[PDB]
Design a protein around this ligand. Structure first.
Ligand code: MG
Length: 476
């Protein structure tokens, strides 16, 4: 986005500056070129001269202003996508009640009861429990008053900046490229869910190439569904964005919200309004208040879905700006936020699409970065989606999601204190698709120290998950 205003106020917003992540027994074996991000300015690992709270906001390099003709094309692509989207999902997008927003419905998980509350509740020293009863799905006096303010459309707020405690590549750790979570007030998250929660549940349930969304998918079972779909196309592209979230221009965000969340699609009018409050934001970090115009915040209860919607419209936009007679069935795509796989039977010149994405403020590069950019003739087995490859399991004939060994090694090299046993079982769920030999090697350092699930047990669990009848039949 565009930093338009920076001022200092006499009230500090304290941030988490001590890492919860610690090395495991695997760190000594795998020696990964990875580590926890910098949470302090005076981290000894940082390049001696880097200022942490200048790199974390360096992503804000402006807010691209689109011309009239480009805006008119964007609205047309947004409307056509909304058309396809609501054709599949339906028009049952009536507001969720206070109770349903807290407890969640079928397709939407409950609100997290213990996570960060937001502002100004963090200054009052109040946890999420003091504001909202998560047991009974009711609200206290504080949230109640704010929800009434959101109905009148007079509610203003601040975003709280947290440093993301996570594993990052040593080059990024050393360069101070720590990511940030923009924690929004708990009432905003609740009300956003109230306004578009029903829509979000439907998008999770109906995920796939038809709506262009993988939000709500389980890669274990859905990789077969996705793989066989993209295997039928002549050309497949692996597209990468740089700073996808921050580079959403105000024009693109406003027009999208207007075209997708219309009342005629079954939405409450306030659905559009609450999403538009994400466009111009104020961010609180220590003594500094930074006003940003444009870009998506990280902590909205629908960032993945909003990002995914924009991604779909960007592809439609860029192709229509370059070629004539381009429709939704000219190509096919799956998206999860910034992550994207595109396919077509047409020889689409994606290299030529670069400045067309630039008119939206977005920069595209091929994932498997090779000489002279994007190339034709790539298939589904060549690409990466959600950090997973599309490999054929030769025992069943189904596509399996395979993560790279370096990534698995990195994930296994660090954990929060006391969570190791739970993390191991979870990562084993991902490591099973790498095969018996790699699986065994990856969990070698943990043997005798923790319970490691047998490859056999997890393989059989998977076969039934993807196709019950197959595992039923495999007993012929
Ligand atoms: Mg990718």
């Amino acid at each position: 986005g565009l930093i338009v205003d920076t001022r200092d106020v006499e009230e500090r917003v304290h941030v988490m500056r001590k890492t919860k992540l610690a090395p495991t027994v695997a760190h000594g074996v795998f020696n990964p070129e990875f580590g926890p991000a910098a949470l302090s300015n005076k981290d000894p690992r940082l390049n001696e001269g880097v200022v942490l709270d200048e790199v974390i906001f360096s992503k804000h390099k402006g807010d691209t202003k689109m011309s009239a003709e480009d805006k008119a094309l964007f609205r047309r692509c947004a409307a056509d996508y909304a058309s396809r989207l609501h054709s599949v999902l339906g028009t049952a997008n009536a507001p969720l009640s206070i109770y349903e927003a807290i407890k969640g419905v079928d397709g939407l998980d409950a609100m997290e009861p213990d996570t960060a509350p937001g502002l100004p509740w963090a200054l009052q020293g109040k946890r999420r429990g003091a504001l909202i009863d998560f047991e009974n799905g009711t609200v206290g006096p504080e949230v109640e008053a704010a929800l009434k303010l959101m109905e009148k459309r007079e509610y203003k707020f601040a975003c709280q900046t947290f440093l993301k405690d996570e594993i990052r590549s040593m080059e990024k750790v050393r360069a101070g490229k720590t990511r940030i979570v923009d924690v929004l007030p708990v009432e905003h998250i609740l009300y956003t869910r109230m306004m578009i929660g029903r829509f979000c549940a439907q998008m999770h349930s109906n995920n796939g190439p038809q709506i262009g969304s993988a939000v709500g998918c389980n890669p274990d079972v859905d990789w077969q569904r996705f793989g066989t779909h993209f295997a039928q196309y002549r050309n497949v592209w692996d597209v990468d964005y740089s700073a996808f979230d921050a580079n959403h221009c105000s024009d693109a965000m406003n027009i999208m919200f207007e075209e997708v969340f219309r009342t005629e699609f079954g939405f409450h009018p306030n659905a559009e309004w609450i999403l538009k409050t994400l466009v111009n934001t104020e961010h609180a970090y220590e003594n500094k208040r930074i006003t940003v115009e444009g870009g998506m915040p990280s902590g909205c209860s629908a960032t993945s879905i909003i990002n995914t919607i924009l991604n779909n419209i960007y592809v439609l936009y860029a192709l229509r700006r370059h070629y004539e007679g381009v429709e939704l069935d000219t190509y096919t795509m799956i998206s999860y936020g910034d992550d994207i796989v595109v396919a077509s039977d047409y020889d689409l010149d994606f290299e030529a699409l670069k400045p067309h994405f630039k008119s939206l403020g977005q920069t595209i590069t091929p994932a498997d970065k090779s000489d002279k950019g994007f190339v034709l003739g790539h298939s589904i087995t060549d690409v990466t989606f959600l950090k997973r490859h599309f490999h054929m399991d030769y025992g069943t004939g189904f596509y399996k999601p395979v993560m790279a060994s370096k990534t698995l090694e990195a994930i296994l090299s660090f954990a929060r204190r006391g969570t190791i046993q739970e993390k191991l079982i979870s990562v084993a769920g991902l490591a099973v698709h790498s095969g018996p030999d790699e699986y065994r090697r990856l969990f070698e350092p943990f043997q005798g120290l923790f319970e490691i699930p047998s490859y056999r047990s997890l393989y059989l669990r998977w076969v039934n998950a993807v196709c019950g009848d197959a595992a039923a039949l495999a007993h012929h």
